[PDB]
Amino acid sequence: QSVYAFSARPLAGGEPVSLGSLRGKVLLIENVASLGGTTVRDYTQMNELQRRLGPRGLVVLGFPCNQFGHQENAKNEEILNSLKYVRPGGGFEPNFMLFEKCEVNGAGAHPLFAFLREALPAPSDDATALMTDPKLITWSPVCRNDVAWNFEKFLVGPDGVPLRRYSRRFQTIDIEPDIEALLS
Amino acid sequence: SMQSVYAFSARPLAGGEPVSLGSLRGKVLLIENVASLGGTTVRDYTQMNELQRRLGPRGLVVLGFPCNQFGHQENAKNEEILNSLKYVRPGGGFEPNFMLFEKCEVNGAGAHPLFAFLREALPAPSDDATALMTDPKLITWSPVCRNDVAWNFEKFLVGPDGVPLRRYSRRFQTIDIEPDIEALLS
Amino acid sequence: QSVYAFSARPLAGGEPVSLGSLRGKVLLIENVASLGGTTVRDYTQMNELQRRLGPRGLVVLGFPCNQFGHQENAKNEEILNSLKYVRPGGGFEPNFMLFEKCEVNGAGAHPLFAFLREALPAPSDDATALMTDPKLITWSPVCRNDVAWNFEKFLVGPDGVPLRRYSRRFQTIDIEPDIEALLS
Amino acid sequence: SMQSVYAFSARPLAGGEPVSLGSLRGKVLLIENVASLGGTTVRDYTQMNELQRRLGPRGLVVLGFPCNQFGHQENAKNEEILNSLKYVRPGGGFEPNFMLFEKCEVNGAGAHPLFAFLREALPAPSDDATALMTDPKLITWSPVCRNDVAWNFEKFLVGPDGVPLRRYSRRFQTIDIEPDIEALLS
Asked: Which residues are reported to carry the modification N6-acetyllysine (chains B, D)?
């Protein structure tokens, strides 16, 4: 029933981090990309939430993924430099945990995302849209619960149970009221 | 604010005046998107004929909508489809005993409004909420939606008030829908 | 250098026919389909050429192929019925040899077509067009010499050497002057 | 009736007034479609810089055209590309020493006219006349032509009269073009 069964390797490499190390925390999980249309908006909002609400129990987790218009083509070792010097650029550094690149859809999906997709089969704000241009669906198999683009969001309660999914178009910062409800 | 299937109409395969589904009030409807050269063409057409024959007198109406969006398995023209069924597959003189409509799309911006409606009303098959397509190259319509019909011969069961009741996947046999139909006829 | 190295099984099944059995004949080879936009035009013209020029040394050979808009979905055992009763319909029967369904492009291509494509890398009448809708290119790998659609044509001389390739838009019957030159 | 490359112009990466290639008469041109996050980005950019540095004084001009049609390997905006090269890949402070133009398409109906021309003039790479794409899902432009650029970093060598002389595939190293360039410079 919970995300605590799963682990992932930090972007820099090294030992996997178990999500069970985050028991009691509210988690905001996003699949991320460095050259997407919402890279700047979502990374800056993720930083803002982590800074403001981290001390109260929020942990933001980002999972780089190259399945959506190949908008994460850089290697693991290149991503922080892209964020700092290209987009957002201007010295930007994430203040939350990034993991190694993975897949979120198809047979190669990281098990955490297979789990999240099945637990919350469609975004709360957009139950219907999957992809406008079918040429951009290039993973296999394709499922009705698949992540549609960069920066979908999954909100997980302090018991590790996925609570709500938000689409590519639902701004990260607009999840704050739902996070604050869980914190208090 | 919720429509029923009776809002919609479709042209018979032979052409001519649209038939409004509103004329079918009181009937239980089994609606399928069909194809003439699909892996389940024989099984579903034979089973649809069986249900129509046996349960028609008690209020079942089976409605088939040819569609070429799934492996291009309905490439024949409207005027060719009955010949394909009769002489090719199933062949052997086979004739549908239920209503077929003109070829249409079920997915994407060009979808017939009846299917856009059914998909929204029943957003995933009751028996398989997750599978959409194994080979992504076979998803060729636009836009793509989570509620899209996945292959030839999905099934929609509609009550005698026009309300969609249940959706069944491409793998769920037509004949296995009989108990759900019987419950509505009763 | 010649097509005589290759064999194919007749549509009805049974022992392969070696193309070496056709030494001395002019060959017109087409990839065919039963539900294509030029099915009627090309099948009727193929019959006409076989009837008129067969006695003088022409052999027409058709290779059903489902790689182009899946326009050959019928099984081998179904194709003649489709031609007779659906399209062209009206009792139509090919008067030339049809073979079992095969692929002409990609790693699974019948070796005859791999050979023909390499020998004559682009149609004589259209060196450039391959596909308008890229979603219809679904074989692998993709090569510059690939057959573009149903009913490309390959004209082979009486020595078995491929002489000329013709595109999907070059009518079968318009190959007659080139055939007649080789016959005489 | 045959054009030369001098018929065409392109806007510098930084923007502003189109540069006509006609201003380059007398120069040997090496034209490449480029990308910042490709498997040969480091190799080709480093080798292009080397050729430009060594053979520039003798008449070589290297011209790079960013293009996002191949695995979306040029997703960065025009205003981001130099930063990606400097700080990401190759990184380490790398700066091109040759002219880059604004992002464009090389294949399909939207292709920059220079590439539509080059493709027709030299319809297949001299070293690989046959390969176009291994994974068909990566062919996403329209229409598709037999002469299409197959991946990032194809190369076109143009003589000092503007006539395209030779095309080289995505796999043929930039530095391995040097002998052909030297022959034209001589």
From this structure: 77, 103, 137
CATH number of the domain located at residue range(s) D1-186 in this protein: 3.40.30.10
Query: Pairing mode, if any, of strands B99-100 and C7-8?
Result: unpaired
Residues 6+ apart with CB under 8 A from D6: D20, D21, D22, D24, D25, D162
CA angle C116, C122, C124 (to 5 degrees): 105
Nearest to D13 by CA among D52, D75, D63: D63
Q: Which of A137, A132, A124, A6 is nearest to A67 (CA)?
A: A137
The 3-state DSSP composition of chain C as helix, strand, coil percent (nearest 5) reads 30, 20, 45
Tell me which chain B residue has its CA closest to the CA of residue D137: B137
- Cα(B55)–Cα(B58) distance, integer angstroms: 5
What does the alpha-carbon distance between residue C181 and residue C26 come to, in Å, rounded to a whole number? 10
Structure token pair of residue A41: 């908006």
Query: Is CATH 3.40.30.10 what the domain over C1-184 is classified as, yes or no?
Result: yes
Alpha helices for D24-152 (secondary structure H): 41-55, 78-87, 113-121
The bridge status of strand C129-131 relative to strand D144-145 is: antiparallel
Query: What Cα–Cα distance (Å) separates residue C52 from each residue in C30, C174, D118, D171?
Result: 18, 14, 45, 50
The Cα C122–Cα D147 span in angstroms is 10
My answer on whether omega of the bond before C10 falls inside 30° of 0, hence cis, is no
Asked whether A82 and D88 are in contact (CB, 8 A), the reply is yes
Chain mean position to CA D137: 23
Put simply, the answer to whether D145 touches C137 (Cβ < 8 Å) is: no
Number of H helices, E strands in chain A: 4, 9
Contact A35 D137 (CB under 8 A): no
Pairing of strands C17-18, C7-8: antiparallel
Q: Where are the domains of chain C?
A: 1-184
Asked if residue A171 lies in contact with residue A28, where contact means CB atoms within 8 angstroms, the answer is no
Give chain C's count of helices (H) and strands (E). 4, 9
Q: Which of B133, B141, B146 sits opposite A122 (nearest CB)?
A: B146
Chain A residues close to D76, C-beta within 8 Å? 35, 86-87
Q: Tokens 């041109």 appear where?
A: D29
Check: CB of residue C167 under 8 Å from CB of residue C123. Answer: yes
Residues D72-100: b if buried by 16+ CB within 10 A, e if exposed: bbbbbebebbbbbbbbbbbbeebebebbb
Spatial contact of D177 and D155, defined as CB atoms under 8 Å apart: yes
Q: How was this structure determined?
A: X-ray
